[PDB]
Amino acid sequence: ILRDLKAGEQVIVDVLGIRTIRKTESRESSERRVELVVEQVAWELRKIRDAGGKVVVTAGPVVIHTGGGEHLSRLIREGYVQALLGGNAIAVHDIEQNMMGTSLGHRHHLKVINTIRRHGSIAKGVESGIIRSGVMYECVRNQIPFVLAGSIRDDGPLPDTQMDLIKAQEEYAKHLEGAEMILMLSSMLHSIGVGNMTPAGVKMVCVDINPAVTKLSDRGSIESVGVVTDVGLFLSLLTQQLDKL
Amino acid sequence: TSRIRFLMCPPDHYDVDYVINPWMEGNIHKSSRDRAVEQWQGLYQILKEHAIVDLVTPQKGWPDLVFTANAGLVLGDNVVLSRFLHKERQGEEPYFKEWFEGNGYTVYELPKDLPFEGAGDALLDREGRWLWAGYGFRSELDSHPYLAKWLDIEVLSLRLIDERFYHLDTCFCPLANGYLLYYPGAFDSYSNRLIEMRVAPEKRIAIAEADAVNFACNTVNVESIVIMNKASDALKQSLTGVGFQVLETPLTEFLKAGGAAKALTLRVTEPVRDEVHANVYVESRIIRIEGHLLDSGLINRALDMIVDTGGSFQVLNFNLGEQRQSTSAAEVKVSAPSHEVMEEIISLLIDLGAVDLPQDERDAKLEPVIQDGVAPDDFYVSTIYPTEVRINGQWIKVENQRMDGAIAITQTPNGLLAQCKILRDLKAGEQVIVDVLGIRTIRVSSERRVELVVEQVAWELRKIRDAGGKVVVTAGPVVIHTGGGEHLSRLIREGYVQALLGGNAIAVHDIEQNMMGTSLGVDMKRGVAVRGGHRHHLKVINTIRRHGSIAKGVESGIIRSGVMYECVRNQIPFVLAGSIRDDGPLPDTQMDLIKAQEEYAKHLEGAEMILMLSSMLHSIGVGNMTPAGVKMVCVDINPATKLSDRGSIESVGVVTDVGLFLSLLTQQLDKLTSP
């Protein structure tokens, strides 16, 4: 794996001189209940921004896999997001989409992870101009803090990813301080995690298509709302509904 | 003094005329009174060969008078008279009272509207040591301390949870020499825990559902004789194996009304010990609650949570507000069968904004921390809501609120600080709130395919086990939630599993199910809970950290069964990978994920097959590390499993419930052991 390579070793490049040895037959919800919710979330998100509040977002790679990418970029770009919490995959997938227009097809994916490790961090791949757009791009430009927490499933990982889960929890917690809204977009594990840490009196929006996730918004109906459509659609609507000024 | 006497009543006016239990349903006027007579006569006559039998006069218009087991409870010269829940049986009370009075018994009557239905719902230990009392469907929990005082006996309370077993004597039967005949499925986990503390395993005779719906616990025991309706051969061997002689007599016309042998009798000569006196474990506490109770269904929320948790209530007063839009106020006497249950209930009501009577307000209890990152026994588990605790008479706001934590009290220059902390952050010297005093808050695979795959995978597990191969299982907490953990621990125990790869949560919930019978506070004997609490599994996390490892938890005796138990007992290597959502974590969880990946990969070497039991995050991680030519079975209920990408040859996927799969899997591995 990439992180086990030692300076000095020879590594195969290009595609000459390679064959495989397979056997033979080896080889042989509701929707405008959503713009309902959206229209509300949009307005809450408005006034918190104006009032100098603090919004936190958790996000899974599914944001990138649907259209969600550039929409989250705008949000962070236009002052709506004061922190972003995720894992390895959301950062690598965003960077793959912006650096190549693809979203995992493994060559593109691994080439991204290797490049960011070559430069030594995501902020350095931005200072050096290899990253010029996207979710992670905006965070660095606009100095929005992010924490990427490791998982048992991580390729690489990126240098930025916190593979010590104890410190990862403490970094999540610290950045959650004073949060008024937590925006949770298809972030599966990270949503539950953030939930656990967050006290009442904090508005929490939860989006996923699995309406079996929104099930686990076991707080008020006045401090929790859960919708069940894809974040692409959601973040899309949320962006043009926000744009209506 | 050694002569035994029963009260019965002949079925002259017997029939099924109404429906007040599930057995009666569909059975109205389907009773054959001739067959009822000859069946009653059979019992009467077998009973007269071993005892005395007195009779009440039968009374037209009260068919269920034949079930004298519910007339009251007699101990010595005292009888507490039954008070029936349903009015269809309330007209029996005068006729029972009259018989009891005419036979010289001192008759105690319960308050009106407080139900209690007699020896049918309360059963003496046969060596007179105590009284077993049921509640849940008929008798009320708050009748129990009356029994203790009036009959002067220790009273133990058991909660019934199956509506087919609505009287204690339908699923519970103390016997001579201390043997017990019961049906575990009729009780909740706390009640079962209790039975298991009081009656030794060699003296427990837990019966099967086939025997229980023939009313095999509804048994009359004289000395070494047990009389019932129908007994399986398995049951007969069990009983006569320990010295009882079994007598079967058909009682099916009475099963149509929901009773059998023991329901048709009442033993009025019961052993009185001089050393035996009143004793109540039932506790009660009065709370006050205010808001829009009728409006937001808050009062109905709270009462539901009390019953569901195994407690009971009496609303003492309800008062509508001043004007039309005002807040309502209630005062509720809350009752529990034990302190442990009271603490679960009060935790749940604190959360809702209930508060103590001014006269009963108390300081929070404190116990010190003596180990870093370990809380003392019975620490209070915080919630997401704003919280004040009462220290030295003063209510103070808790800081850094957060849900699955403890509350630590310390002295500082500027006064007392009350702080919410997670378990691992607790430091020696700190004082932590325990108990519940002084606390308030301020607020799609077809059937055909699943069977075929179960055939294949079973055949392959058998094959690999015989060959000295290596099977690796990766499983998530849903395996335990869904109810499939005994199936998993059986696989591990019988040698089909060589390594277990998982996370923090599956280990916690499986130890939780085996220590308490709950997974995330939801009792497993029932499929349900009005809510479910975090007290049970946080206590697990804290206990294991106190010991220092799951292995130390097994060596000490506090873990006796389950998945993790079997891994330890049969030296099966397991790896627990950390995640961002982990409570605790357990001492055994690897929170360095570079090390985790390494350990996963090492235990994956030489694997011939991998079982992936509903844990997406871990199944992908494990898949990523495995080369082709390893067989992979992937089970999850969400079709997006479609990440089984390696072809028909070496990766099969099935879309169904994981416990259901595991259930059929062990079943299939059994019928391959027939020859």
Place this chain on the structure above:
Amino acid sequence: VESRIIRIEGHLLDSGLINRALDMIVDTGGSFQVLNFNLGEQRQSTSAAEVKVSAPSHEVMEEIISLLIDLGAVDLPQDERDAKLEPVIQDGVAPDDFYVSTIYPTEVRINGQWIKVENQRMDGAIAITQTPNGLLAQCKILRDLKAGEQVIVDVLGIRTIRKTESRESSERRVELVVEQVAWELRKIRDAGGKVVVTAGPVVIHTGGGEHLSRLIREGYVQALLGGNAIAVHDIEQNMMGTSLGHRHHLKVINT
């Protein structure tokens, strides 16, 4: 605006009974005022509450009393009245404002007597007959009604006899498809082609209704194939702004 006082009994606080009653009232368009509350002495004692109900019109009052009847609410001993009866004058059609039966055991008051309804079924009417064997009340489905029969209208003189605890994909793969379908549908219309639509009531239940209307309105649809439900649900949405709540639904079919 109309007011009534109802009475409710049972285990009101722990069953959620009185909570459900208040919810129905407010959600259906009325308002309530709890006048009094007698608490039972023990948990199994019965409790009673008297509640004033307001509605903005008669139509909404009877909609609300209907839902309350199911939960077992009654008129005061003093306010009991006979059910209003109106005759059937055309086979298979009920008189305006006929009461719509539910699945629960029902009694009606005729000539001061409470009478059990036979052949109880939901979404029917109740017919009253004087027979050689006395008064007969039976549920009938609308199409079984015969000219001459008397049928209960309004909501007076009706109570239920329940026991106690009786009563206690991807998305812009879509605008992908859409954009294609839209264009095909365009040129077929222009070319004088022929488009056929099948449609289930789910079109109406979501927003779909008026959108399908436009399509048919602006020449895009040359035939429509469906069932009973799509037609009744469309007509309910346009005639009342509701979409099945059974009174609205049955009133449409009867009309």
Place this chain on the structure above:
Amino acid sequence: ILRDLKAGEQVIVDVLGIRTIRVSSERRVELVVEQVAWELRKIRDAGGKVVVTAGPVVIHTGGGEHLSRLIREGYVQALLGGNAIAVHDIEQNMMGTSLGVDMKRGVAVRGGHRHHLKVINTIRRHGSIAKGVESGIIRSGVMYECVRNQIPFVLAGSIRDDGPLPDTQMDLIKAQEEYAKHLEGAEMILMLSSMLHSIGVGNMTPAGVKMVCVDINPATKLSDRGSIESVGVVTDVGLFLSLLTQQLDKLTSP
């Protein structure tokens, strides 16, 4: 279509001369299986009446032998269904296929309509499912058992029916009538994955009748009659039926 063929017409046979020009947990399903089994046993002993309404998925999924065993052993007093469930069950027993898919395998690259159209045509030739059993060409299955043990069944027509069978009621006013008549005195209704028919049957049933509703799609949530008299389980219908007969067996042990 088959019913439009007139005597005298010549019809192409064989294949010559033809070308074309182109989510309930495990714990809950078991508990409900306990309850429903106990209730079926109870009702059978009492001389009660259990009514089953079932759709073709029962047969597709592979649960028909379980259903025909229930009917054979006396737990079912009436069967209410449609054209399709009758066709596929006779198809499975005559050929081992449901919609051309071999049942010995869980799979088919495609699956053809030849097998069940041959069933529809054969039964119309005899004139009834009953005549199909008397002649020997139907020897097993759901419909077989109904005929052999004289269990009344009603088959309601629908818009999607091929054929139909001679036994299908294509006048739906009559269908509703026949459904309602066979529903009188029912103590329990089993609803085995057939939404259209389960709703129709529900609409006609008064409260106080026990209703078990089994379907794999949670929207079953149309079980509206309360915890007391309507239980719903979300799982595969054949799997349910499999555990159900298994549970009815171990209640026959003593």
